[PDB]
Design a protein around this motif. Structure first.
Motif, PDB file in Angstrom:
ATOM      1  N   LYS A  60       0.595  -3.422   6.925  1.00 59.68           N
ATOM      2  CA  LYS A  60       1.144  -1.904   7.422  1.00 59.68           C
ATOM      3  C   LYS A  60       1.162  -1.606   8.648  1.00 59.68           C
ATOM      4  O   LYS A  60       1.664  -2.315   9.647  1.00 59.68           O
ATOM      5  N   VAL A  61       0.503  -0.416   9.173  1.00 59.15           N
ATOM      6  CA  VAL A  61       0.507   0.220  10.287  1.00 59.15           C
ATOM      7  C   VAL A  61       1.278   1.497  10.880  1.00 59.15           C
ATOM      8  O   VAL A  61       2.310   1.815   9.971  1.00 59.15           O
TER       9      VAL A  61
ATOM     10  N   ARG B  24       4.577   5.408   8.279  1.00 59.71           N
ATOM     11  CA  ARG B  24       3.548   4.268   7.971  1.00 59.71           C
ATOM     12  C   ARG B  24       4.604   2.872   8.055  1.00 59.71           C
ATOM     13  O   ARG B  24       4.673   2.437   6.990  1.00 59.71           O
ATOM     14  N   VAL B  25       4.971   2.559   9.127  1.00 57.74           N
ATOM     15  CA  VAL B  25       6.052   1.653   9.176  1.00 57.74           C
ATOM     16  C   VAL B  25       5.453   0.440   8.838  1.00 57.74           C
ATOM     17  O   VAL B  25       4.276   0.042   9.171  1.00 57.74           O
TER      18      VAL B  25
ATOM     19  N   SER C 145       0.862  -1.168  -0.077  1.00 57.55           N
ATOM     20  CA  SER C 145       0.054  -0.098  -0.070  1.00 57.55           C
ATOM     21  C   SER C 145       0.824   1.326   0.097  1.00 57.55           C
ATOM     22  O   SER C 145       0.613   2.500  -0.438  1.00 57.55           O
ATOM     23  N   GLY C 146       2.381   0.976   0.518  1.00 53.67           N
ATOM     24  CA  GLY C 146       3.186   1.849   0.634  1.00 53.67           C
ATOM     25  C   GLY C 146       4.306   1.058   0.971  1.00 53.67           C
ATOM     26  O   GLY C 146       4.542   0.011   0.773  1.00 53.67           O
ATOM     27  N   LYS C 147       4.937   1.277   2.331  1.00 51.13           N
ATOM     28  CA  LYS C 147       6.106   0.798   2.866  1.00 51.13           C
ATOM     29  C   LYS C 147       7.020   1.144   3.822  1.00 51.13           C
ATOM     30  O   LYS C 147       7.520   0.727   4.786  1.00 51.13           O
ATOM     31  N   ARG C 148       7.604   2.574   3.329  1.00 54.52           N
ATOM     32  CA  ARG C 148       8.529   3.326   4.086  1.00 54.52           C
ATOM     33  C   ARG C 148       9.675   2.474   4.203  1.00 54.52           C
ATOM     34  O   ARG C 148       9.912   1.698   3.400  1.00 54.52           O
TER      35      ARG C 148
ATOM     36  N   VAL D 145      11.796   2.848  13.323  1.00 55.54           N
ATOM     37  CA  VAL D 145      11.324   4.109  13.359  1.00 55.54           C
ATOM     38  C   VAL D 145      12.155   4.902  14.572  1.00 55.54           C
ATOM     39  O   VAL D 145      12.715   5.964  14.126  1.00 55.54           O
ATOM     40  N   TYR D 146      12.171   4.374  15.726  1.00 55.42           N
ATOM     41  CA  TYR D 146      12.875   4.847  16.747  1.00 55.42           C
ATOM     42  C   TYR D 146      14.285   5.073  16.541  1.00 55.42           C
ATOM     43  O   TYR D 146      14.901   6.422  16.736  1.00 55.42           O
TER      44      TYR D 146
END
Length: 88
Positions: free
Chosen positions: A41-42, A54-55, A1-4, A63-64
RNA sequence: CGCGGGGUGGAGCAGCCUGGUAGCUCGUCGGGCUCAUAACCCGAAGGUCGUCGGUUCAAAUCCGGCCCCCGCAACCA
RNA sequence: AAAAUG
RNA sequence: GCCCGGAUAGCUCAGUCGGUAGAGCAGGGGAUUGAAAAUCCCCGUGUCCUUGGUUCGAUUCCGAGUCCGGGCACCA
RNA sequence: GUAGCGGGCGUGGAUCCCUGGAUGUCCGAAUGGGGGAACCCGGCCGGCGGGAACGCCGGUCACCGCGCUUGCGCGGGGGGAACCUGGGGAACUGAAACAUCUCAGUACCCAGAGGAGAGGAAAGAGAAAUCGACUCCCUGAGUAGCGGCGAGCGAAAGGGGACCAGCCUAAACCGUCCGGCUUGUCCGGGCGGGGUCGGGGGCCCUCGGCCGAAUCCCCAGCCUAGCCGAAGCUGUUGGGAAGCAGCGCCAGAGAGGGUGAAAGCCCCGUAGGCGAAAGGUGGGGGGAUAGGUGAGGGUACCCGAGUACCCCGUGGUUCGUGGAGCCAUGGGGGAAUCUGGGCGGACCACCGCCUAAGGCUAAGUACUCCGGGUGACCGAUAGCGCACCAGUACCGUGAGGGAAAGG
RNA sequence: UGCCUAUUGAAGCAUGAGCCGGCGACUCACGGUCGUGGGCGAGCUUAAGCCGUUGAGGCGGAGGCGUAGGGAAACCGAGUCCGAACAGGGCGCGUCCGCGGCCGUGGACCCGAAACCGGGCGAGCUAGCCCUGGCCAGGGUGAAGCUGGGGUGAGACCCAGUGGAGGCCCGAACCGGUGGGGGAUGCAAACCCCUCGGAUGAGCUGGGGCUAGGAGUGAAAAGCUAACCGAGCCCGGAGAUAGC
RNA sequence: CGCGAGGGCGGCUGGAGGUAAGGGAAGUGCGAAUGCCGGCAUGAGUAACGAUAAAGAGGGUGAGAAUCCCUCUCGCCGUAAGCCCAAGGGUUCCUACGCAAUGGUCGUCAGCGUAGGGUUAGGCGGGACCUAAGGUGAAGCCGAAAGGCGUAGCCGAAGGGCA
RNA sequence: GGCCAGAAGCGCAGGGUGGGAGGUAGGCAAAUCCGCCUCCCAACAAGCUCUGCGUGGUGGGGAAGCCCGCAACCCCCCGAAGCCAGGGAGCCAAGAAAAGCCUCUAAGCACAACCUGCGGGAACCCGUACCGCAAACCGACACAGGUGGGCGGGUGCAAGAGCACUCAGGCGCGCGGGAGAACCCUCGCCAAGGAACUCUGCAAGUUGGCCCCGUAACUUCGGGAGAAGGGGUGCUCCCUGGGGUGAUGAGCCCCGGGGAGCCGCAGUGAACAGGCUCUGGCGACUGUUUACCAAAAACACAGCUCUCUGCGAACUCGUAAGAGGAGGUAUAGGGAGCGACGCUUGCCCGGUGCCGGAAGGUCAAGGGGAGGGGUGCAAGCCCCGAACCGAAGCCCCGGUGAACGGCGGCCGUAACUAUAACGGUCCUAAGGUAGCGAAAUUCCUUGUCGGGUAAGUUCCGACCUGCACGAAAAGCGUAACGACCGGAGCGCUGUCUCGGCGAGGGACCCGGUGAAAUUGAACUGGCCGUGAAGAUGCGGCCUACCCGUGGCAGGACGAAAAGACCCCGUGGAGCUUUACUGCAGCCUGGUGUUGGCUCUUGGUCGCGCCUGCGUAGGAUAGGUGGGAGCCUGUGAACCCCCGCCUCCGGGUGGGGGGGAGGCGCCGGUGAAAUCCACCCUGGCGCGGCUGGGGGCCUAACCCUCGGAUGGGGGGACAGCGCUUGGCGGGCAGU
RNA sequence: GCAAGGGUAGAAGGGGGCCUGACUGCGAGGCCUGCAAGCCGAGCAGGGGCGAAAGCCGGGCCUAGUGAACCGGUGGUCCCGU
């Protein structure tokens, strides 16, 4: 849907098998249909300032770590590229 | 013409594919109760199981032949 | 507080 | 074809972490009853499926056998 | 493009042909804004007309992505006959029905790349005391296998050839600049140095010896106009000689076309041999930078993480659930750093191979819009749909369809 | 008693053909199998590629057939397999070119579907909806309300007049299309005449917009979606397949 | 001359190519596929000549006219079959010459052929004004890629506004 | 022929609008502007503004008339759908946006800037021919078709954009000329008769306007009503009543009324212009529909019922974002069926569907690991795998009909017979009620009676053995409505007995232009035979000079459509379902996103103490083992108050007095006791590790909140990813 | 034993005693026949039964009582096992 960080989503198939097992008698296959495996996703809100990623939520941690980097730069509205990019 | 269901004591229904035991209600008959009739009560009788034969040790029961009884179909031109 | 006819 | 429960009085079903075999009903004998029920009494009958083995002995405990009932999966 | 007036220019070297430059309205990625393409309307600076209204004229103002304190400087956008890579991805058909399977990862759609694209220096192959990046061709082989074990699909190793090429990084470790913090001799961001492996590298002491670009340059050579090129006369029939008849001649040139008919020697040419001020191209042969150059002895500091690995769901391979690995990977769990980790067809144990989770890399290969050359290729109902003013006329709202016609 | 075709059987009142002239159908590639013309023979033969040629051919043994067969295999071998067997019984000897016949895979003798699938083009027709505008002669019936009178305890209610309602009536424009005739190579790929229905409403109509192919729209007929819609048109898969 | 398919000879036509023996290659032979392309026939001098609103005559011009101009009669429309505006159409407008073809006849005519003319706006209608539906679309959201929603802004008229 | 334009200023009609004076929680505090409150005046105005119309200095235009070219303009009447306009009244369905335009303050500025005047200047781009209800647009054509808006004169008729004639203006339709047949089209008339025609009065006729009488059943009361059925209508003259403008009198128009009298076959004298009635069916009604064969009894419709939906609604579209629903909120949305209104709408939950059931049954991943296997020398690495714990679904239990659906058979019986109120029996989930009924439903069937008719397979009324009505796929009725379908009458008539005549346009002849389908070739006759069984073409016979024109349709199995019927093809499509197999969607467990804190109960291995009442028997002996030859004192023997087992017999620990005490075979019992063990059964109590269920919270996630680094609400659920199983004609392939 | 047929008492019928050849390896030669199936079968070997013996015995007086392949299941074994 995306991915980052991570990356996109494949397009799997199917298996409707109606049979024994090969541990009794044979085992035939009813039908192969095109499935689509969306990439679990999420979403993530983070303190760099007031950021949102959107990790692929299997990388949420990344992310952190990426936040654990004071690149030394005030506002820019997004400051994600640096982050999401000066990343790796 | 073809399918399929059915003929069992007097009436109406079981029993038949799972062959040897005919069951039920009603009514018929006898005895009670009652002044008497019903009702109610007790006790009996009664069937070549449609017919003409076949298989069997044995046929209401299984297999064919008609006789009436009942249903369903008989469509395209 | 009570089980038809002639 | 695997996994479960079973076989006990005529019938329907119980039960000790081994010591008797028991209920409910049908059935028969009796009381009561306008009638017919419901009540009330006393019973009646057992190879506890068949085999072994366990135990001093087994309804029971375990092996095995046959019939019975439940559940699930296959089917070239 | 000839036909015509009407005018003109050329040996004071025109026209023409090659090279570079100049000007190049408007639309079109279209980019000041708009918009029913080729039109309409504006900001800012400057200049024209008497010019304040009006109007011309020249500049200049899209958006997106990267790198410096706010302005900037590099880039992108669209097109291209096929060919190429990736992301998506049918059915008809075949199976003499049909659902697995087949057609097929084909048609098509989309993104992207370029003269190619892709791939590419081993966590490979597979049984060989073995091989040694990759790609292409020939074999291997319709073998091995896969398969409602049907229809049907179908490798790889090895062997011949073409080509030939190898390389950078991340991490230890040292230095430096910067901004945060618990103002601790500490944390991580950016540069530089080091360091690139089947075993090496870092850091300590012990011994110091050169090859070479894939990038920059220069010339050759080759494209892009051209020039030189041998040798025949007479007669004769004919409308017209190149025919016919008689004497010749050139030839590194007897390919071809053309000239009133069938010419080596008539014309253009052909063999052969020369030519570039200019602009492309260009290791084929040579110059120069970049970069790369050894051997022992010790710690036990580094060797690519949500990774390997295991499990669930799938894809690729000859492999369709199979005994089903390997290579990919959406989901869950989740390590280790050479006493490490993967592979050699479940799984162990031996034996051996290789170093994953960062990147680049010529050539040999593919195609034919374009230029040239050939053809037991067509010769105007053929050959391209077009030999001609054709993707036209005409047809269709449109996508689209699509002629005829040569002497 | 024509020709062709198709037939048990055609002059046949079965198919096809107006006539002529052109175009028009068993191919090629790769495998394979017989036959045949050759080279060579226990042997035969080269692929790709390199070298020459510029209508010279060489080179190139990787590889491929063939020399041994039996057996699922291990394995053995002029044998072998089954088997205990010294019974028995089953299996048990050429290449390279050329040409021809036929087979396999390619459309593959040639035309022909109805259809399936992908990507685009279409609502300038037609259906619906949205925005903004228009249009509906003249007649007729005469609702509610008001007003006055009457009525009653008050009311209800009743009356005249006024008033002008309505998917109301007659009937043009406008919209439509009932019955009949005509038309039927038409004036016309749906028309003309007479006759009919609606006509202030669920009305008609201009202009600007939106919805699409298993989808739209539909007061619903599977109707309409650019003159044939139980699944549009165009291009492509495509020479689909066709036991006809 | 060949059994035949054909092969020679001769005569007119034609006017520039052709191709032996013997061999090799194929897009190689047509009468039929309601085949395809073209040409020409038959029906056939037949049906038709497109609204039953209607014609007649005298002059003109002219090679030639029922069909053109003029005149006088007759007839038909007249909420039109008349005037004005939108759309669409693109020179069909006017003038001078013309008739092959185009007109369902004719043609001296024309909406046809050739040539030359013609369209003049501060106030009309549009734009340097306004918004509607709806389009488009900085941000922003979403999708494998194309791309889908969409704020502001902009575009959009027969509606508003303006002499 | 007797007008047109025209500023300012005049008049006449209108449309707009209260004027004050103070306050102020609002217009995203900036306004002295709005908006709201308060009180002097004022009020069906005035004033102030703004339009229209007249008038206007003045300019313009100006026929019929001859040769070939002359110069007024006033007076009444009718009169808008247009104007004043944003006028008024009434109604329910409740009726664009923005700019220009006014006004108010901000920033800033006031040497700017605005406002009114007057003069000078400046004022771009695009369209403009022509056709335009058509020969210039759309229909292949110079096509009888299609195309939006405005103007659209006069007289006559009740009115009018109708009808007839006609102005202005424009046309006579791009082949003509003759004939004067059939036949065709269109049109007129008809003796006597009047539906006998025919499927049918199809068609055609009659009637037709206005005024006045006069009109039934039935009715939802409006309406049936134009019901029906009649009479009048022209022209001239006489008297007379009210209207509008004038002016109150005159012309001018507008509605009437009463008398006489004239003419024709006929007075809405032509054109426009209903025939009617009685009675059934269906559908309530106006509407809508198959463009191009069906306009209907079909669809729709108000209205009734069932049902889903609490709002981030349900439902629809979309992969998603999001949108519609709806800027709505159960008196609302979605789905379904029936279909105004009246009277009603019975019985059956067996089977299917749906709803409800925290139990059971079955159940997939996953949890769980008894136990087994492959390997190694091993530790180990790997594998299978039972108990048991495990959702939705299904089974099972129950409700449900305006949910899908369903709603009986055979015998007997009354004092003439007939019939059967009554009875017997078999089956059922239950046995069709009311009302209809040979019906848009009845097969037998033209049922049987009545009616209607001279005669009636139709129609109407009746009766039922209803082949096979029946209640919301509604039942039975119903005033009104219908280009709907059936049966009758009257009127009128060529529809007909039965055909005749007449008109026009074709047809026919001449001149001009000039197609089409079809077509093997033709030199193309009849009858009997014959033949693939229906011959111009064979046979025999018979007829027949050659070739045309106008006509008719029997044949050429005439033309046209590779038959639409039928079958065949292992052809195609659309549709269905409890056909197969899938997919969308929805349900569901396990995981990820995913976090605190309590409560609680399970299952597991530990460990810790109890636990065990056959018959003999010191008495609540668990099991086999060791056992001599056994231990208390920190002290038992006995005692009480106490928690605990149990059947009571019979106990398991507490504590103090107290202080000695206490054992092992015994004798029997299948088996013997002190004490130590390891262990079977069951229970209790702390710990490991896993589970399930209940609550509370917030911090993720989600929704919201005058623009929040936040405040509310929800809350580890929802949502979403991966995975499990199920439902699943909604869709797909077959 | 069961349909019909053929055959049959000089037994294929009825009874009795011992048995298990309702064997293992094979199989000349034929019947029938498109294929592939079906049917008969002497004889040799091994190790057995019944009979003193000659001998008979690879199921049943005879013809029906059955189903290719593929895919699996249970066993077994000289084979293969990346």
């Amino acid at each position: 849907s995306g991915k980052r960080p991570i990356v996109a989503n494949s397009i799997q198939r199917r298996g409707k098998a109606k049979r024994e097992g090969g541990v009794g008698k044979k085992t035939t296959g009813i039908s192969k249909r095109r499935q689509y495996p969306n990439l679990q996703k999420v979403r993530v809100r983070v303190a760099g300032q007031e950021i949102t990623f959107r990790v692929a939520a299997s990388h949420i941690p990344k992310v952190y770590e990426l936040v654990e980097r004071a690149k030394g730069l005030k506002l820019e509205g997004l400051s994600p590229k640096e982050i999401k990019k000066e990343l790796l």
